[PDB]
Design a protein around this ligand. Structure first.
Ligand SMILES: [Ca+2]
Ligand SMILES: [Ca+2]
Lengths: 569, 569
């Protein structure tokens, strides 16, 4: 149950962002042992919310902290909210949360990239309250992303910095006590007419509802009094890639009111094409990251607008949420700009045996299904989402992974019978044991970088050969979901060398030549959109330098050649 | 015989540098099999000499060439040289040479860092002559440095670019037909008095000779008519680190004349000290390279003066010739500037079983002794050379390496009974099997970089422990011959991260703290002096970035903290 909070005449949002008080444990779980939540925090510093905490201070100990940290602020409940339902919402807490209201625990959460909330109607006092949030960053074999602890040092095999903090907005909001809990929308098209299937869940199903469908002019085009209905939109304005159209499911229920934007669009996979509204779609874009200077993974909407301007400028039509769900604000923006999205759960780091009883096991599986349920509940109504990605680069050569991912694939397909399912490959085509469960084959391939570094002449034959093998083995359309080269801005050389701006351009260009000679490729996603931070390592010059743009969102040389190609496509 | 050529009333040098014609093979050994030397080269480009050829052109195929290339120019013999002995000298040809004069082969050479010559008295014509030089860059298991060919790709394990070309001056010179062939000088000191032991070898030994010893104002201070003698120098000005004094052995022999600079200084080792003229010497400096922009490993005397100015500025007193003998010009400069040198043979890359019948074997051994003989013959008379280094980072954990390096160390001790012998370690101290053969133990250690990257607080405990183990195992004084961290100029961060300027400074500090607590450490050589080029690899951002100075010889931040330490030491 996770409708995005709204403001209208009936519902109201109180943002709890700004500056909080903050302190870290000085030994493992010190805050829980000493019950720091039972009184205000002492010996604290300021910490912005939303933001990672790791890059804010000058303190290497805080940057590299392993374990739990403690946030605290105060909030008020006005007299005017006296008889309302009160909800405290967290867009995310990375990775693990324990929430305390006035010294008492009210909820917990596992998973750093999906929202959660707590009903505090009967617990919050009028006037001042104290909100205390314990934030833990430890990843074990039953978390997503996967990791483990050694003796404490945090180990993991994914390539992005394990930022921790309150990365997304914290909201206290009110609704009437009889209210709209959940909404599902599915759409079909018969030539010119759209059909809108909706289902609305309330906590008083016998009472009266009024449902409108409004166009972008806010004009009513359909109307009903049923909580579940199928309604026809004559001459429907379809939601198109690069040309969004959003209708509004506008719902009056008792004293309550909720308005849900949605797009009318169809998806169909053929043998070798990806069809949106019947017309072939070729993915041009990037896997991204929630990453920028100072604030780590913290939501930054000005950064988001800049990134969308860059995506439009360079001719991209799509992105993948590597390697975790992004903020709903980004998903709303993609809905509005007509950007096509591959939505991914954080099942990353399942690589180096990995699928064994003492590591990635049935407990990991059950949590993997739960994360998918939550992702679906949050994003099921976004027209921008066209595909679910259930994993990034698992060690799928292991025979034990076959049963694991058959279970995961069956689960998401039971939740959602309409969008294709996929996941990205890094093992050899000959060894993979899971891609047969997918509708689209996605491969991460770094010819000219991790294979044959510097050997420009070998990139084109290498990727073409591999692509054909992937198509011959599975007979499905193929997306190259990652390829590129680390590139230091300002590093030029003639003849070109790895890390130079010229090499990045040539590397991408030869990979593209291989893709252009295949008839079953339905997309190219360059890695990476922008330089981002990684865990420290000798192959990472202050992070991952595969960005086509710098971390400050300025283009390297290759960006202009990619634009010339994508704008002609 | 390898006396450095001189100009005087009796001997004359003609430099053959400038711009040659140049062309590479298009398939393996093409010029040999098509017999290109028989006529002037056709379809050629210009190539400077001395210089590597790899970074001169815009052509990747030449930069990465494997095999042979061809150089050619014309030279003149003047009428005035009619009755002289004529010698063609190459300072070096990297790696393999075949020399042709007017289309006939006159000599060959294996080894890219030591000089060779050919008597051309009987073959050169008056007036114009055609000089053709085939230059090969293939390294095999019995070459130094070590490498091997796979299927044609060059493999090797050392960490510097395999530049090829004619890196040092080419000289045609004349002497009388009866002439001075070789000179050896050894010195002892008795209070304030030097004894100069010398031994002159000539072309006609029964004839009469006159030997003067001259001070720096050109005044005779000893004299003799013997080919072999000891002559006393009372109140002898000693050659001192940082304050050089050079006498001259001035020899007249028939029509011939040769003047040999030399220095009076003594070396002695105790179990905790390195004594030069009785005073303890603590090595402060760097392993270097012959490397600069555009010209690869080509000799550049302006660059050498700038380097020596920077060594003086930073308070360095020494360098090691990593990992091959340097140009004699640099050795003369060290003689004149009072810089102490560890002189090293190119026995690098014997690492990844290495010491096996099929790899490093008896052929490599015999060649290793041969290069030591040649290095000793060239540099025996340099006061700046205080120690021979016979290897860099061999895989000396193999039992088979024990007998190998016992042979090598025995041999160099037979050539030179006065200078200490060493070789640099990278294997674990518990595994090493050869350092008992050395007079000084030298270790390459990168705590904070290759071990425990980024963990500043573990550098000091890690190196101190390792240092004490090396001393406990062998009971000899220890030089840390390499330590440091890759550093991108302009990369700053707070807190610091690997690759940042601030990290390089802290990493060297913590290593220095460990050395300051170990009384048996007699030297600290930072790696590296200046950023230099490497074979391409994902850990090498346009080469090796451990330079304290940039490749263009400007300091990074850590240079100023090093200077403070070394100048007050
Ligand atoms: Ca959010
Ligand atoms: Ca020379």
């Amino acid at each position: 149950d996770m409708l995005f909070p709204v403001d209208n005449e009936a519902r109201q949002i109180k943002e709890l962002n700004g500056i909080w008080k903050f302190k870290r444990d000085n030994y493992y779980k010190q805050g829980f042992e000493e019950k720091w939540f039972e009184k205000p925090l002492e010996d604290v510093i300021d910490m912005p919310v939303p933001s990672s905490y790791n890059d804010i201070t000058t303190d290497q100990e805080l940057r590299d902290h392993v374990g739990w940290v403690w946030y605290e602020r105060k909030f008020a409940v006005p007299r005017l909210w006296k008889d309302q339902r009160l909800v405290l919402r967290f867009g995310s807490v990375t990775h693990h949360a324990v929430i305390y209201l006035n010294g008492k625990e009210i909820t917990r959460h596992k998973g750093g990239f999906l929202p959660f909330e707590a009903d505090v109607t009967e617990m919050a006092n009028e006037g001042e309250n104290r909100l205390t949030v314990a934030v833990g960053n430890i990843l074990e074999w039953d978390c997503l992303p996967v990791g483990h602890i050694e003796y404490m040092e945090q180990k993991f095999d994914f390539d992005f910095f394990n930022y921790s903090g309150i990365h997304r907005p914290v909201r206290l909001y009110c609704t009437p006590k009889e209210y709209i809990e959940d909404i599902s929308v599915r759409t079909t098209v018969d030539d010119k007419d759209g059909m809108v299937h909706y289902e609305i869940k309330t906590n008083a199903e016998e009472k009266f509802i009024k449902v409108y469908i409004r166009d972008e002019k806010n004009q009513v085009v359909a109307e009903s009094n049923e909580m579940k209905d199928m309604v026809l939109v004559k001459d429907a304005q379809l939601w198109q890639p690069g040309s969004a159209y959003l209708y509004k499911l506008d719902i009056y229920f008792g004293q309550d009111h909720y308005t849900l934007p949605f797009g009318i669009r169809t998806i169909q996979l053929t043998e070798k094409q990806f069809l949106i509204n019947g017309k072939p779609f070729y993915f041009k874009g990037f896997g991204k990251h929630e990453d920028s200077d100072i604030r780590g993974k913290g939501l930054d909407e000005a950064l988001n607008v800049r990134d969308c301007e860059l995506l439009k400028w360079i001719g991209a039509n799509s992105f993948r949420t590597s390697h975790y769900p992004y903020a709903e604000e980004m998903m709303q923006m993609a809905d509005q700009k007509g950007i096509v999205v591959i939505d991914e759960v954080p099942a990353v780091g399942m690589n180096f045996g990995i699928f064994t009883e003492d590591k990635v096991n049935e407990k990991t599986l059950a949590y993997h299904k739960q994360v998918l349920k939550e992702l679906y509940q949050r994003d099921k109504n976004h027209p921008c989402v066209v595909m679910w990605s259930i994993t990034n680069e698992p060690h799928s050569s292991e025979e034990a992974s076959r049963n694991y991912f058959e279970e995961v694939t069956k689960y998401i397909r039971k939740l959602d019978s309409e969008r294709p399912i996929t996941g990205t490959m890094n093992v050899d085509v000959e060894e993979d044991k899971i891609s047969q469960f997918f509708d689209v084959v996605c491969i991460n391939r770094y010819f000219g970088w991790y294979v044959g570094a510097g050997k420009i002449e070998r990139i084109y034959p290498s990727l073409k050969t591999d692509l054909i093998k992937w198509h011959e083995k599975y007979g499905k359309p193929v997306i190259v979901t990652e390829y590129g080269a680390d590139t230091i801005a300002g590093l030029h050389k003639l003849p070109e060398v790895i890390f130079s701006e010229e090499y990045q351009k040539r590397c991408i260009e030869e990979n593209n030549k291989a893709m252009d000679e295949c008839d079953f490729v339905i997309g190219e996603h360059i890695w990476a959109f922008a330089d981002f931070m990684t865990a420290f390592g000798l192959k990472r010059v202050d992070g991952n330098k595969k960005g086509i743009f710098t971390r400050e969102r300025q283009p390297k040389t290759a960006a202009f050649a990619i634009r010339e190609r994508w704008r002609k496509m």
